[PDB]
């Protein structure tokens, strides 16, 4: 039987349950599935790594390769503009959430053509990732490490720079075979330098798209019909409308920002809230007694 309050992962002040018992009946049917019916379902940026560590905010994916030395800082300047307006709608509380997808579409748009202005040779983003400042959450050897062990899928649904996720987790020593990353990647000409992005876009709101387009991963995986699913933002709730079939899944939001805003919001949508929480340590607690 599983017991939240027996848990002294769940007991930290950052973690927000608005239906403990339900969160505990789903978490008992994860134990009972064990490893052969667990699969994880993970966004990148913010969810598996930190949104701010000493006392400083850490980069994504994207601005890793903003801030690298390959980038001018006018482009920077022009970058920030970017995010200034375009931010401004992503956070507008009138604007529906389909309404905001052209906008959207425009943002990733306008601020990839400048990166691809800027000449981003695919040999140096092994160095440009190696200087950069970026940080995986606290437990993420545990994290990926028990999951490589027992063979569990673990598809990263990224909307961020897939060359560079990659890179990063490479670097970390955690890019598994059991790790599918899905992501906007970089086009590279003859020269290896980048001149576009491909597939189709993703964005934090399209991702139910993407999900439906990864057919053949999901279908291979029938039997891993119960899901962590973790996520930053409530585009990501939809990472997992792509799975076969779904006995048990378990949705786990961290909370970085807006936190007044939004918190309400995130305990009705996530069945577990951890507010500015920069470790993994309640899903490695699941996998703990799951696996
Ligand atoms: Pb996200």
């Given at each position: ?143 990926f ?24 987790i490479?670097?970390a020593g955690v890019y ?116």
């Amino acid at each position: 039987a599983v017991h939240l309050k027996m848990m002294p992962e769940f007991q930290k002040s950052s973690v927000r349950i608005k239906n403990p018992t339900r969160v505990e009946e789903i978490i008992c049917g994860l134990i009972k599935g064990g490893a052969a019916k667990l699969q994880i379902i993970t966004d990148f940026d913010m969810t598996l790594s930190r949104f701010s560590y000493n006392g400083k905010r850490c980069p994504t994916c994207h601005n890793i390769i903003d801030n690298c030395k390959l980038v001018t800082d006018e482009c920077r300047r022009k970058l920030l503009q970017l995010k200034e307006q375009y931010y401004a709608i992503e956070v507008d509380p009138v604007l529906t959430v389909e309404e905001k997808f052209p906008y959207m579409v425009e943002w990733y748009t306008k601020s990839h053509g400048l990166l691809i202005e800027q000449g981003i040779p695919k040999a140096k983003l092994k160095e440009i990732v190696a200087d950069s400042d970026v940080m995986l959450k606290e437990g993420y050897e545990n994290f990926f490490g028990k999951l490589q062990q027992h063979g569990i899928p673990v598809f990263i649904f990224s909307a961020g720079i897939g060359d560079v996720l990659e890179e990063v987790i490479r670097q970390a020593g955690v890019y598994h075979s059991n790790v599918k990353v899905v992501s906007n990647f970089m086009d590279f000409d003859e020269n290896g330098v980048l001149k576009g992005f491909k597939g189709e876009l993703i964005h934090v709101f399209n991702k139910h798209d993407g999900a439906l387009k990864n057919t053949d991963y999901f279908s291979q995986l029938k039997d891993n019909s119960n899901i962590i699913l973790l996520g930053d933002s409530q585009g990501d709730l939809r990472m997992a409308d792509g799975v076969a079939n779904v006995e048990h899944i378990l949705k786990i939001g961290y909370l970085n920002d807006r936190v007044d805003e939004l918190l309400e919001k995130y305990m009705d949508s996530y069945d577990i809230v951890l507010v500015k929480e920069e470790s993994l340590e309640v899903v490695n607690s699941i996998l703990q007694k799951t696996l």
